[PDB]
């Protein structure tokens, strides 16, 4: 019985079936919701009712630098849709520990490309269809 | 060594028979039906009894019956006036008979009942004003009621206050008790257990002492009285022949004590109202012997007061505050056992007992309503829970691992009985001083 | 009966981790700074545990079966590697980029690993004078690593076996009732009670018709 | 008479009967309300009338890092809760030497999770459906 | 009558307590700052109370019987721990974790103790030569603990037993009119007069009516 | 305060049903699903000069009901050829049925009395149609202890 030390480099994304490279340093992705998981009604005396939310979308960052191969494939990827219609990819996320995510996705907006003197970076924007984190990989749960 | 009832076993109620229709000490039932297989005679007592149970508005589940050895019935006409067919009906080891006797005096009519002596077995001898019936030692027999005035008596070898301590021991998921033996020692054995085990105890009785002036008297609930027990007691005229303590606990089975609910003016079916003047209900209310008054075209019983003066609704509500902390301790300290996360006694792990009791037991009472709260005085009606520090814990309780004062505070939200008002008829209507107290 | 890793263990492990890594990619020779002894010939490196950081903290607890506590607390540790000859800054470089290596990292650090890597500092190149004759070609950098430490706790507290609650229910018809409630560790509430029948499953049989009403 | 000093080790956190640990570092919780208690009129001429808050509800923040075993818990009852529609769980706190807390609550909504070079953190929010602190644990009040 | 623990008993039980959890945690031997021993045989740990800081308002006011106040005032104690040889950075480490083991802790620091842990800082390993033979293995870390101090004034100011005041009721009428209030420690403002009689609870009947209604 | 929860399981919007002519209805708006009104008020008031008062009873029950639809939903196309049908055939009458999950729930018959605007844009527009009910009485059958 060895406990996990954290391995950023065991962290994986999977975007379509093929694996993502060429991230940027610090943070690799970021995954945040977009609505509150329960709207709470009170009443006038303090009767209190609750309502479930049936939206569940969130949003995931991906921080790449701007000489990465897998930005012309993204790239590739945006305008395609916009043509034919088609814009969903199935998107995936490990954790080395933490939590996981296995959903389909598409690419929300593009990034802001900026040009100077020291390689930069691009943050795309993944729309995920549901968001949901898993313990799959939690060591215990 | 009192082991703890659960929630299904508050709501059940065992009456102390005399039969022999079964060989275990206890059996439990969902319908007469069932009983009626098992061969107790139409109109016998359980059967009335269960029948009872089974009518009321609030009416439990499921009845469990006890056995007595039973060694000899009767069928009394003593004092009696009859006419009409009279009828009885006895059942003979799954076999069912009816008895007929027409029309006048009640020692003719129980000497003419001898004619029950055929397609039989079993045996019967009267005797002039009532005929004893008594079986061959592999014969069953149950006699019961019919459309005769007569009244059936049982008689055994044992005493209550040596059958009880069986029928606990073979089970002991079961809340009031009840008996069918109605004599003053049997009576004050059956109290005397009930209130050592924490169950309470039903009775009526149809002693006319109740009446009797309050100047004085000898009644077994005077006995009560003076021994200050928890028994609830009823005085009704037919008791001793329809068993009615069935009526009463099928009005206040099923509702849970979690409401503050009282027993004031619930209707009992199966009860006949009191007859009596209203100087004998005064007398009556003197030595907390309950009636069912009947008033307006309908019945009425009449404030529910046990032998000690207290009400039965705050008895009752404590109990099910005893027995709902009991189990809901226990669950949860089962459920930390299955994972190998068991409580340690430690004051990081001792707090959590105050949202596990604050759950189950507690907060129900106060959303239904059963537990005051709010700001009295300088004082405030919220329950309170407080509990010791590793510190505080002697040593030798460290060795025992038994965990010590615990405490717990409510206050209890009683109901309303009786109004008085004070209205004025006038044929017209008559200082200013308009200044801020 | 329920073992594990102490700090020793994965602490001593992690220095020979690196230690392999620079050996089996650079193809220089390898010395750490515990012991001395008269430098080598040739192209070396050196290996230092410069400094350990703390993260406050404890994120995991583990149960022994009798009761015991296993803490594990979050580290990160330093490296301070110096490469001594030939062509310094291009080895330690080397030795970055083979983290990057899928293959050769499976070697030495398996998934499950209670050790990982972390990132890298700036690699300095540095000239330093030998008896006032030769300069000569140096290097510094600083690796760091995260890892896990779990430890295992001096005893355990006595178990809870018997609870004892007194209850106080004030009421107004007269003084308080006292009573007490109790719970024992092997005392079911209803004993064993079969409890109330249950409904049961009809059998198994043919229908003829599709829908059938009957009064 | 010794006065206690504050420990930060003994404040204790209990979701559902359970005790909650993996905590990051600085701050282990934060407890906010979300109205204020009293609602003041205020007449033309300067008659002031006030009137009592009937809605008491609060939140509480808890952080910990994104190694820990309990997000895999908070995760599952998240999900569970959103299918069966019971959200409910006890909830409560204790204070070395402050205002303690003993209330229910629920899992208001998901964090944000970040993945980089070094182990991260989540705060989730919980809500709690009363937010009057106590004086239990005071030494003398 | 009403004692206390003054600053001077809890400065002082705070190194006996961190002095015994080095010990029974590391198996290593310690030694304080305050006086000067040749060093000992084999590995061990030196113990040091580097700095103080002060929280500049009280937090409490506890009032003896006489009048008397004792103030209470919060400090953080900084400790200074450094240790000599063996694997000093692993003995420093396992220092840290302990305080994260709960029975471990409550030997020493048990709920309601006038001072409490806080935090740790960076853990450095160092090499040191002696007599310019040999590199000696050492360690430093910063452990920062919570305290609370009291201290008993020194003596206490009267009371006031008697209060005279003075009124002056300005009006239109003429001049205005003068007149003294006055208070005594023992002087109730009405004597001891029973006041009003009160509304007495009727005595318990019995009634045959639910509801009664008479004109 | 906990023990007034109106609601012991959360409210879920998914578990209204609604059925017309016996398939389930799909495809829903963004904010509000159905509403359902009446058109006339339950008596009438008629009071004298002197103060004396009587009262009515109605017989006109009718109601209607809007049910919003994403414009690209494929339900639109069973109300549209719905309308056609009964244009010429005359048979315009359909069962509807609602259920109150945890309210009042509906149980008549209907039929289409508008067809809504159909509008195209920058964004999936939204469909209102109404669905007259003959008779709007609300049954509060799902809710349990209505003594």
Same mark, same amino acid.
């Given at each position: 019985? +060895?406990?996990?030390?954290?391995?950023?480099?065991?962290?994986?994304?999977?975007?379509?079936?093929?694996?993502?490279?060429?991230?940027?340093?610090?943070?690799?992705?970021?995954?945040?919701?977009?609505?509150?998981?329960?709207?709470?009604?009170?009443?006038?005396?303090?009767?209190?009712? /609750?309502?479930?939310?049936?939206?569940?979308?969130?949003?995931?960052?991906?921080?790449?630098?701007?000489?990465?191969?897998? /930005?012309?494939?993204?790239?590739?990827?945006?305008?395609?849709?916009?043509?034919?219609?088609?814009?969903?990819?199935?998107?995936?996320?490990?954790?080395?520990?933490?939590?996981?995510?296995? +959903?389909?996705?598409?690419?929300?907006?593009?990034?802001?490309?900026?040009?100077?003197?020291?390689?930069?970076?691009?943050?795309?924007?993944?729309?995920?269809?549901?968001?949901?984190?898993?313990?799959?990989?939690?060591?215990?749960? | 060594?009192?082991?703890?009832?659960?929630?299904?076993?508050?709501?059940?109620?065992?009456?102390?028979?005399?039969?022999?229709?079964?060989?275990?000490?206890?059996?439990?039932?969902?319908?007469?039906?069932?009983?009626?297989?098992?061969?107790?005679?139409?109109?016998?007592?359980?059967?009335?009894?269960?029948?009872?149970?089974?009518?009321?508005?609030?009416?439990?589940?499921?009845?469990?019956?006890?056995?007595?050895?039973?060694?000899?019935?009767?069928?009394?006409?003593?004092?009696?006036?009859?006419?009409?067919?009279?009828?009885?009906?006895?059942?003979?080891?799954?076999?069912?008979?009816?008895?007929?006797?027409?029309?006048?005096?009640?020692?003719?009519?129980?000497?003419?009942?001898?004619?029950?002596?055929?397609?039989?077995?079993?045996?019967?001898?009267?005797?002039?004003?009532?005929?004893?019936?008594?079986?061959?030692?592999?014969?069953?027999?149950?006699? @019961?009621?019919?459309?005769?005035?007569?009244?059936?008596?049982?008689?055994?070898?044992?005493?209550?206050?040596?059958?009880?301590?069986?029928?606990?021991?073979?089970?002991?998921?079961?809340?009031?008790?009840?008996?069918?033996?109605?004599?003053?020692?049997?009576?004050?054995?059956?109290?005397?257990?009930?209130?050592?085990?924490?169950?309470?105890?039903?009775?009526?009785?149809?002693?006319?002492?109740?009446?009797?002036?309050?100047?004085?008297?000898?009644?077994?609930?005077?006995?009560?009285?003076?021994?200050?027990?928890?028994?609830?007691?009823?005085?009704?005229? =037919?008791?001793?022949?329809?068993?009615?303590?069935?009526?009463?606990? =099928?009005?206040?089975?099923?509702?849970?004590?979690?409401?503050?609910?009282?027993?004031?003016?619930?209707?009992?079916?199966?009860?006949?109202?009191?007859? =009596?003047?209203?100087?004998?209900?005064?007398?009556?209310?003197?030595?907390?012997?309950?009636?069912?008054?009947?008033?307006?075209?309908?019945?009425?019983?009449?404030?529910?007061?046990?032998?000690?003066?207290?009400?039965?609704?705050?008895?009752?509500?404590?109990?099910?505050?005893?027995?709902?902390?009991?189990?809901?301790?226990?669950?949860?300290?089962?459920?930390?056992?299955?994972?190998?996360?068991?409580?340690?006694?430690?004051?990081?792990?001792?707090?959590?007992?105050?949202?596990?009791?604050?759950?189950?037991?507690?907060?129900? @009472?106060?959303?239904?309503?059963?537990?005051?709260?709010?700001?009295?005085?300088?004082?405030?009606?919220?329950?309170?829970?407080?509990?010791?520090?590793?510190?505080?814990?002697?040593?030798?309780?460290?060795?025992?691992?038994?965990?010590?004062?615990?405490?717990?505070?409510?206050?209890?939200?009683?109901?309303?009985?009786?109004?008085?008002?004070?209205?004025?008829?006038?044929?017209?209507?008559?200082?200013?001083?308009?200044?801020?107290? | 009966?329920?073992?594990?890793?102490?700090?020793?263990?994965?602490?001593?492990?992690?220095?020979?981790?690196?230690?392999?890594?620079?050996?089996?990619?650079?193809?220089?020779?390898?010395? *750490?700074?515990?012991?001395?002894?008269?430098?080598?010939?040739?192209?070396?490196?050196?290996?230092?545990?410069?400094?350990?950081?703390?993260?406050?903290?404890?994120?995991?607890?583990?149960?022994?079966?009798?009761?015991?506590?296993?803490?594990?607390?979050?580290?990160?540790?330093?490296?301070?590697?110096?490469?001594?000859?030939?062509?310094?800054?291009?080895?330690?470089?080397?030795?970055?980029?083979?983290?990057?290596?899928?293959?050769?990292?499976?070697?030495?650090?398996?998934?499950?690993?209670?050790?990982?890597?972390?990132?890298?500092?700036?690699?300095?190149?540095?000239?330093?004078?030998?008896?006032?004759?030769?300069?000569?070609?140096?290097?510094?950098?600083?690796?760091?690593?995260?890892?896990?430490?779990?430890?295992?706790?001096?005893?355990?507290? *006595?178990?809870? *076996?018997?609870?004892?609650?007194?209850? %106080?229910? %004030?009421?107004?018809?007269?003084?308080?009732?006292?009573?007490?409630?109790?719970? %024992?560790?092997?005392?079911?509430?209803?004993?064993? %009670?079969?409890?109330?029948?249950?409904?049961?499953?009809?059998?198994?049989?043919?229908?003829?018709?599709?829908?059938?009403?009957?009064?």
């Amino acid at each position: 019985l +060895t406990l996990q030390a954290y391995d950023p480099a065991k962290v994986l994304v999977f975007i379509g079936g093929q694996r993502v490279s060429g991230f940027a340093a610090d943070t690799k992705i970021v995954i945040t919701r977009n609505n509150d998981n329960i709207s709470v009604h009170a009443g006038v005396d303090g009767e209190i009712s /609750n309502a479930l939310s049936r939206d569940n979308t969130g949003v995931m960052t991906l921080s790449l630098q701007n000489t990465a191969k897998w /930005n012309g494939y993204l790239a590739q990827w945006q305008r395609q849709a916009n043509v034919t219609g088609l814009i969903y990819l199935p998107v995936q996320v490990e954790g080395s520990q933490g939590l996981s995510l296995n +959903t389909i996705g598409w690419i929300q907006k593009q990034p802001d490309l900026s040009y100077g003197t020291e390689v930069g970076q691009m943050d795309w924007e993944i729309g995920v269809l549901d968001a949901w984190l898993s313990p799959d990989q939690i060591q215990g749960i | 060594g009192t082991q703890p009832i659960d929630t299904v076993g508050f709501e059940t109620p065992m009456f102390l028979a005399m039969h022999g229709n079964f060989p275990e000490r206890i059996r439990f039932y969902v319908s007469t039906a069932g009983m009626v297989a098992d061969g107790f005679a139409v109109g016998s007592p359980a059967y009335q009894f269960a029948t009872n149970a089974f009518a009321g508005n609030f009416a439990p589940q499921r009845v469990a019956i006890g056995r007595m050895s039973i060694d000899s019935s009767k069928v009394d006409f003593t004092g009696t006036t009859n006419t009409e067919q009279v009828v009885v009906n006895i059942t003979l080891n799954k076999v069912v008979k009816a008895v007929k006797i027409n029309v006048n005096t009640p020692a003719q009519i129980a000497t003419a009942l001898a004619d029950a002596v055929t397609a039989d077995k079993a045996t019967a001898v009267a005797t002039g004003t009532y005929v004893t019936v008594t079986a061959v030692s592999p014969n069953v027999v149950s006699v @019961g009621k019919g459309a005769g005035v007569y009244k059936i008596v049982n008689e055994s070898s044992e005493t209550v206050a040596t059958v009880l301590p069986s029928v606990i021991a073979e089970n002991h998921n079961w809340y009031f008790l009840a008996t069918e033996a109605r004599s003053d020692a049997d009576i004050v054995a059956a109290a005397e257990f009930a209130k050592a085990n924490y169950k309470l105890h039903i009775y009526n009785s149809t002693d006319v002492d109740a009446y009797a002036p309050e100047n004085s008297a000898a009644s077994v609930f005077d006995t009560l009285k003076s021994l200050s027990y928890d028994s609830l007691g009823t005085s009704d005229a =037919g008791a001793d022949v329809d068993f009615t303590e069935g009526s009463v606990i =099928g009005a206040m089975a099923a509702n849970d004590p979690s409401y503050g609910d009282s027993l004031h003016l619930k209707t009992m079916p199966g009860m006949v109202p009191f007859a =009596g003047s209203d100087t004998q209900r005064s007398n009556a209310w003197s030595r907390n012997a309950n009636i069912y008054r009947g008033l307006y075209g309908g019945g009425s019983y009449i404030e529910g007061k046990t032998s000690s003066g207290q009400y039965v609704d705050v008895i009752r509500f404590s109990h099910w505050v005893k027995f709902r902390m009991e189990e809901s301790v226990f669950a949860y300290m089962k459920r930390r056992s299955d994972m190998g996360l068991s409580m340690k006694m430690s004051d990081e792990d001792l707090p959590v007992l105050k949202s596990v009791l604050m759950n189950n037991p507690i907060n129900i @009472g106060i959303r239904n309503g059963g537990i005051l709260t709010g700001y009295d005085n300088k004082v405030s009606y919220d329950p309170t829970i407080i509990i010791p520090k590793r510190a505080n814990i002697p040593t030798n309780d460290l060795a025992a691992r038994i965990l010590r004062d615990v405490k717990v505070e409510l206050v209890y939200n009683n109901s309303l009985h009786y109004v008085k008002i004070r209205a004025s008829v006038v044929l017209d209507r008559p200082s200013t001083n308009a200044q801020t107290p | 009966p329920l073992d594990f890793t102490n700090s020793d263990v994965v602490m001593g492990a992690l220095t020979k981790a690196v230690g392999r890594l620079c050996l089996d990619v650079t193809g220089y020779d390898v010395v *750490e700074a515990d012991e001395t002894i008269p430098k080598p010939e040739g192209p070396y490196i050196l290996v230092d545990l410069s400094l350990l950081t703390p993260l406050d903290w404890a994120t995991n607890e583990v149960v022994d079966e009798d009761g015991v506590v296993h803490t594990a607390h979050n580290y990160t540790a330093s490296y301070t590697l110096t490469a001594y000859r030939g062509k310094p800054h291009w080895a330690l470089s080397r030795v970055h980029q083979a983290f990057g290596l899928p293959f050769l990292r499976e070697k030495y650090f398996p998934t499950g690993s209670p050790y990982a890597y972390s990132s890298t500092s700036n690699i300095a190149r540095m000239r330093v004078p030998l008896n006032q004759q030769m300069f000569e070609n140096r290097a510094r950098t600083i690796v760091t690593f995260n890892a896990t430490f779990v430890e295992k706790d001096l005893g355990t507290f *006595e178990d809870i *076996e018997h609870i004892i609650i007194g209850i %106080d229910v %004030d009421n107004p018809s007269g003084p308080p009732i006292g009573i007490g409630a109790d719970y %024992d560790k092997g005392v079911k509430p209803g004993g064993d %009670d079969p409890g109330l029948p249950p409904k049961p499953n009809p059998p198994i049989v043919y229908h003829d018709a599709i829908a059938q009403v009957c009064m």
